[PDB]
Amino acid sequence: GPGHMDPDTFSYNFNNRPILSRRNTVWLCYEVERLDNGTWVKMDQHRGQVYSELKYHPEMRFLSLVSKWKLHRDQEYEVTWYISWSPCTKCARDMATFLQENTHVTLTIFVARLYYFWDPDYQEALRSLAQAGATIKIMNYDEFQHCWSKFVYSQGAPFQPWDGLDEYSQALSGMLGEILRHSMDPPTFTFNFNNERHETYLCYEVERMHNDTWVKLNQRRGFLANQRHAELCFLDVIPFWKLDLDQDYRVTCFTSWSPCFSCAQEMAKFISKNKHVSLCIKTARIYQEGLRTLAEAGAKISIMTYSEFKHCWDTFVDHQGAPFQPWDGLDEHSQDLSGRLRAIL
Amino acid sequence: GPGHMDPDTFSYNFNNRPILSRRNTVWLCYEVERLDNGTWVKMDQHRGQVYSELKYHPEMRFLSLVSKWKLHRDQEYEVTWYISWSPCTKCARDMATFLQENTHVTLTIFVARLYYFWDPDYQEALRSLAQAGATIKIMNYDEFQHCWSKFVYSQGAPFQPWDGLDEYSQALSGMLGEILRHSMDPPTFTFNFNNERHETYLCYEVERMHNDTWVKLNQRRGFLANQRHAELCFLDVIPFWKLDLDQDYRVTCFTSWSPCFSCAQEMAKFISKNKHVSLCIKTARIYQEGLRTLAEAGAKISIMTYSEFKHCWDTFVDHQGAPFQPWDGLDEHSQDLSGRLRAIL
Amino acid sequence: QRSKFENEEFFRKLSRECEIKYTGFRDRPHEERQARFQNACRDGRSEIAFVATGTNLSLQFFPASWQGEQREYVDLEREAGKVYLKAPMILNGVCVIWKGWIDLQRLDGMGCLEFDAQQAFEEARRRTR
Amino acid sequence: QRSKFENEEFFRKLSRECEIKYTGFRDRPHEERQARFQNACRDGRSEIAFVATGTNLSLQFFPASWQGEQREYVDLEREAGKVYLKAPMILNGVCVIWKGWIDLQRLDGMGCLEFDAQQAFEEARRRTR
Amino acid sequence: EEFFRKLSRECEIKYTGFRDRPHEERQARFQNACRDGRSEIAFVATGTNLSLQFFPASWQGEQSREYVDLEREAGKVYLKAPMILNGVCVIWKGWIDLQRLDGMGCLEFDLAQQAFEEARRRTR
Amino acid sequence: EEFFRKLSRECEIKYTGFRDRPHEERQARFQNACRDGRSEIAFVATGTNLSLQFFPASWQGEQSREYVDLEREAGKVYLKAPMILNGVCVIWKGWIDLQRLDGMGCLEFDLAQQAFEEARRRTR
Amino acid sequence: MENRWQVMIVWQVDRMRINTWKRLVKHHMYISRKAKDWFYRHHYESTNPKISSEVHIPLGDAKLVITTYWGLHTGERDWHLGQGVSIEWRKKRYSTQVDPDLADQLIHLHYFDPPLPSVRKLTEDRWNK
Amino acid sequence: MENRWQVMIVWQVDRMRINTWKRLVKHHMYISRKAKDWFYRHHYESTNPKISSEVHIPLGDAKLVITTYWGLHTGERDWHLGQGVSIEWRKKRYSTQVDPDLADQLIHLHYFDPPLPSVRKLTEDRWNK
Amino acid sequence: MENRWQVMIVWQVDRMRINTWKRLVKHHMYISRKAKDWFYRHHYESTNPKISSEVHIPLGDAKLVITTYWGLHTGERDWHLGQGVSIEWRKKRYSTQVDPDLADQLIHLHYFPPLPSVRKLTEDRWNK
Amino acid sequence: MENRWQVMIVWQVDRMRINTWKRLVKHHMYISRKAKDWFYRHHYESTNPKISSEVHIPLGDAKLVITTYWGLHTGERDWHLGQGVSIEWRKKRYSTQVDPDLADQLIHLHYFPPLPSVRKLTEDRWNK
RNA sequence: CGGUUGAUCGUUUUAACAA
RNA sequence: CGGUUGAUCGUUUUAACAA
Ligand SMILES: [Cl-]
Ligand SMILES: [Cl-]
Ligand SMILES: [Zn+2]
Ligand SMILES: [Zn+2]
Ligand SMILES: [Zn+2]
Ligand SMILES: [Zn+2]
């Protein structure tokens, strides 16, 4: 049925806290659009919401509904899902094999929470689902408002967001970006990491100490951007790794601009509270008291060089078999920035 | 929901023709009773009807409903099912493992049709379900009327049975008795097969010719009773075996009383129409023109002796490790009956 | 008859502006749709439906065995790549004939109507008004 | 107070004819029900409920951490095989105390009530009638 | 042919009967089924899903000598069966011990045949 | 002990990697994983589900010499690992050919030990 | 030609309208007996394998029969999944297919001279306009 | 004793009555604004992990709060699956639990001096009588 | 007693694979009509109680018979009830067993939407 | 590079068996309180990326550690992602592997509604 | 696959849509 | 298993029950 669920179930189930224990049911709100004369028109009757059963997840019921619909196969369809938990292995595999057999339908999925984001089995299932042609995103405030207005029997009552919605959304976006292994295309890399821009993109890697030797972590590698600036999002993503308090970890950051005042203060406080995490920041530009305070807190502020650029191109760039090509005025600008930073610090 | 299904779906799905092709959905009407002060009281809210899904059979949904009910475990419950198709292997196994873990609930099942009664896999699944403690029966006219009055939104309209309901019910009862491998307890055998009684019970076996030698068929062995007399029910069960028209089959019948006039005429016509089926009737009593006509049609009417009694006791009697014990006045009465039949025929 | 056919709204609606198309298995690819349509036209044991594009009206060609009580044809060999359809019937008490054709490739074509107890129904219609 | 407790219908109903029982996990066997009840009585981190046999009234003993704003006891060592319950509360503006006990084997027992702004609520009750 | 030697190396055979039941009655049932017949006997290869089936001749519509014998040596049963495979008349022989329903088995070879050989060469 | 000889007879080992992928890259990945390390290598017995796992030492929280070597002979790799099992210090050694990721492997043996032996005898 | 066919004009309607029509007919047939002379034939009395129901309405000495179907081909619109209706008028082995307008006029001329059951609301296409 | 508890009288009710109460309150709160000064607090504003909703009703200078719960223990009857209600009256950190009769009397004294939302119909036990 | 027997090679498979086989075979001889020359024999047309169904593929003067089986006391997950498939080239009272590869090559020589292939039906992933 | 490694014996099992194990273990140390002396360590408390969870059973002066694993490139139905179980008797820096039978006998010696047994978790029906 | 149905798990799968 | 939730697939799973 189209949009007749009570607000209390919505608020209880679509809470976006990354670790939420007593939500054993999955809710799926689905809508369908059709391509006509080059524009996507809403299909008003082909929308609704379903919930799970003891051994019957909402994806299976949606597949049964699609089978009963008997959509014209000579048309193009876009389906949008809003789901509380990310699909499990069985549901992800069956959705992938459904998408592979029906090329006239595309699927976009918004998730409130990630289900077992620390389990490589579900990570591989989600990666396969994304490779099959599905778009997986994190449900933000706009989507919550849309679901409240469209699928909730609110009777005109205003939507009251829960505490910490934005921080949870940013943390979940960071984890999803880690899981899906996103990469920057060469144009964005060239436009953003040039030393000569209203956005700040930062990459990050993690290493662990073992017998006076640093060993890289395969999963703890990635990058993110701004939606608050990107440093706050990274510091919000950090606590969900559960870094051990007995071993030594080093976090290497590759940031375009220098951190702001509030971001630098937050980073300094975080690295002062956690003595087991060393920080190595290698920036490319400068956006100086905050930088000096951050450096004196324990961080190692440096300037990117050719080796760092080559590592970034090999690591976080979707070059697709293309070697790195440096741009004009790289070495002189890098040397000038390094000298200026050495004189300042 | 309790009893809100339209009459057309009921009439389409609960048709009891043994071979029915285009009914791809399963309907399950369930009701529950509870034991209080030694009497079984109806639980008015714990009843309803469900249907199947693409990969979700009604048994699974009923199990989920039972889980949600949270019945008191210190009580006794009786559940009654009315289902269109007999349960498949997965559903039968899971119902058996549910019954084995919950000893405070008993289950009685009425089936409109038998699903793949010729498939030994489903036969074994049904036998396991019956061994687990479930009672499996064939849905007769009284149960159809009860379901029409209770689970159908008929709005007071009278029930109109379809053509051939009783014959289909008798044929399905015979097939279910063959599948479940029923047996007579010693008291019934002694009371009915004594040569010295308002019921006629008949046993039957089948053999096939192969190089001038009779080979028994393991599945085609059983017995039945009256509900029309038992001979008409047996002749209705016969056509569903699909006996081949090229080989030679012999049907051996062990009947208590002699066939009636109409039953003898029907049997003679049936054995005259089918020349590939020989009939060997070995009766125990006489209920004579019809018998003479049946004998002249091609049958071999005989009288039971000690060997036949021993075979019956070993074959269709639940003796449970007990040898056969003949009763008084057996040999003299058998010899007198044989002499009288020889003089008559 | 002729005046009733040329004057009543229903007959004019079905005779003036009508184009037909075949939508048998709309969720299946074009090739097996063509194969199923050809098979159904050839065996004579299954229905074939032709839906007017504008309205919800449809013509169903049921097999004669499904009637049980009792000129029309669905033929192929007149022209390769086309199916021709003639269906006489009685509509609103007058004898009318439906004529059409659809191509096997597009599963589309044209279709229109023509002209080609009886007194009891006229009396009932007069008393109906 | 005393006159209101002895004269009003609600207090007399909850004080005169009342017997309590524990129905925590009614679909579970007796042994694990006893184990869960003992565990819940001992840890103090989960609720315990006691339902009046006749009516739908129930007493819930929520942990104090769940309140967040602010004598009563659920104790075991007074007698082996029994749990004793004391719960002071304010009902209909007057201070009342609930006293009961249930055995660990039958998960059943007895329970009844006793007697042991304030003027603003009296004014509201007088204006209520 | 590669198929023969692919399914003729280090191949041991083992009985599959009432697997979800205890072993003693399993050998009892194997014993009495091998004695009387009127039943199907399976022998699966360990490596793959290939299986030799022993069907009574009465189950076939029509109609070559092959046997299963256990009375020549106590505690073990010998199996012999010729069968035409891919145009050649190979003969499969083996044995299993009666105590553990396990043993060894191998297939060694002895107008329509040439017709199938021509068709097979044509199917390349 | 019966366990050792039960899992030491006619036991051949075979590599399990990216099984749902073609063989050429499978041996390439086995090659480079055996070269660099920083990965887990599995060797399962054919008969049962027993498996030998090769984990990098950096994955353990703390801390015995054992090796996997392929440069002594081209096209084949040799495996050596001591490990204490049931109170005795058995050593598992084997080899697999690099072309087919199959081969042979066997385990031959070399205050707390006596303590475990006493506890095991007590657990009868 | 060895293929013989039958021609029927079937008005494609959705499932909700079929359910509403059946419910209204059965409600006005038994509870509020304004239409008590009607004969509501149930599912399986027919040679045609796909004929879900058949309502007979006696009009003087003839009868107007409305038969609904299920299991037809899909339609052009989204909710034309294979159900339809057809109305005709018969008198002693003489049948003529009837416009729903004329059918409702006949119904109201003889019987009506919860909403009353009309065929114009059943057969009207709410998805093409 | 290291275990500290809170005492609440919770009226055990079924799911349908909870849904009807919530629907009526929200319908008379926004559409027909006879009760517009009420504050319908949504699910998660509480320290208690199991408190599905909380309706605040200002009565002069104090407020009557009705809180419903989900996730409680099962009841004695068949449809007492773990949901309940509790009504109390508070004025500046002074709270007293209120009889549903008195609660409805207070509600009708101040506001009412689709059916009107009453707590007597919500809390009444239709399964024990 | 044991003087007469019958020997065949039977490949244990899953029930869903048998259903897929008997669905594509019916589809290809009824709807697509690419294999309308094939024959299908049901369970009641054979004397062997364990025969599920038979598919006859004409190859000119000879035929290829592929038969399915229930009732095998082998089982897949040790349920003492397993399915199986057998292949037999038949030419005027001459019979032989054929491995799936040669049978598929025979089918492709004379014949030819998924297609009914014998390798997909007979191959195994439970032991490989 | 290849100079340092770690060797363990890991038994491939199914995910549902792992879930059953970790459900009965939690039940028996939380509700029934028969095994309240056992310890449970989650995934984030171990350095090995492939460790799922660890269960510690005290046996007096020593302990029995049973560890679960995801991420194995073996797989059950060849999905390159399989679970596994490992057993280890540990006594004050001394460690050894223990077969399931001896571990179950150790548990029954010191300890003891279904019970958490290691044979039911480690045994196989896919190859037996 | 309209077959004297050997049975694809067909809106032939649905309580209110005209209360 | 009220845990700064590591997440058992809890009527915490349901459109109308007071229209
Ligand atoms: Cl899911
Ligand atoms: Cl079923
Ligand atoms: Zn799922
Ligand atoms: Zn900032
Ligand atoms: Zn089933
Ligand atoms: Zn009779």
Residue numbers in the entry:
A (entry chain B), B (entry chain A): -3 to 192, 198 to 228, 239 to 298, 305 to 362
C (entry chain D), D (entry chain H): 8 to 77, 83 to 128, 139 to 151
E (entry chain F), F (entry chain J): 15 to 77, 82 to 128, 138 to 151
G (entry chain C), H (entry chain G): 1 to 113, 161 to 176
I (entry chain E), J (entry chain I): 1 to 112, 161 to 176
List sentences from the manuscript.
The refined C2-symmetrized map reaches 2.8 Å resolution and allows us to build an atomic model unambiguously. In the asymmetric unit of this sA3G-VC-RNA20 structure, a single sA3G assembles with two VCs, named VCred and VCblue. On the other hand, the sA3G-VCred-RNA20 interface involves neither mutations nor heterodimer interactions; therefore, it most likely reveals biologically relevant interactions. The protein-protein interface of sA3G-Vifred is biologically pivotal for complex formation because it includes A3G amino acid D128, which has been identified as a determinant of species-specific A3G-Vif interaction. Our cryo-EM structure shows sA3G side chains D128 and D130 proximal to the side chain of R15 located in Vifred helix α1, suggesting that their rotamers form bifurcated hydrogen bonds. The preceding sA3G residue, W127, makes contact with Vifred H43, forming a π-π interaction between the aromatic rings. The dinucleotide rG6rA7 is located at the sA3G-Vifred interface. The well-resolved nucleotide, rA7, is buried deeper and is accommodated in the pocket of sA3G NTD formed by NTD loops α1/β1 and β4/α4. In addition, the 2′-hydroxyl group of rG6 ribose can form bifurcated hydrogen bonds with side chains H42 and H43 of Vifred. We tested deaminase activity on ssRNA by sA3G, but no rC deaminase reaction was observed using in vitro deamination assay, even though base rC9 points toward the pseudo-catalytic pocket of sA3G NTD.
HIV-1 hijacks a host ubiquitin ligase complex using a viral infectivity factor, Vif, to degrade the antiviral factor, APOBEC3G (A3G). A3G is a human, single-stranded DNA (ssDNA) deaminase that catalyzes fatal mutations in genomes of viruses such as HIV-1 [Reviewed in 6–9]. Here we show reconstitution of the A3G-Vif complex and subsequent A3G ubiquitination in vitro and report the cryo-EM structure of the A3G-Vif complex at 2.8 Å resolution using solubility-enhanced variants of A3G and Vif. In summary, our high-resolution cryo-EM structure of sA3G-VC-RNA20 revealed that Vif binds sA3G through interactions with ssRNA.
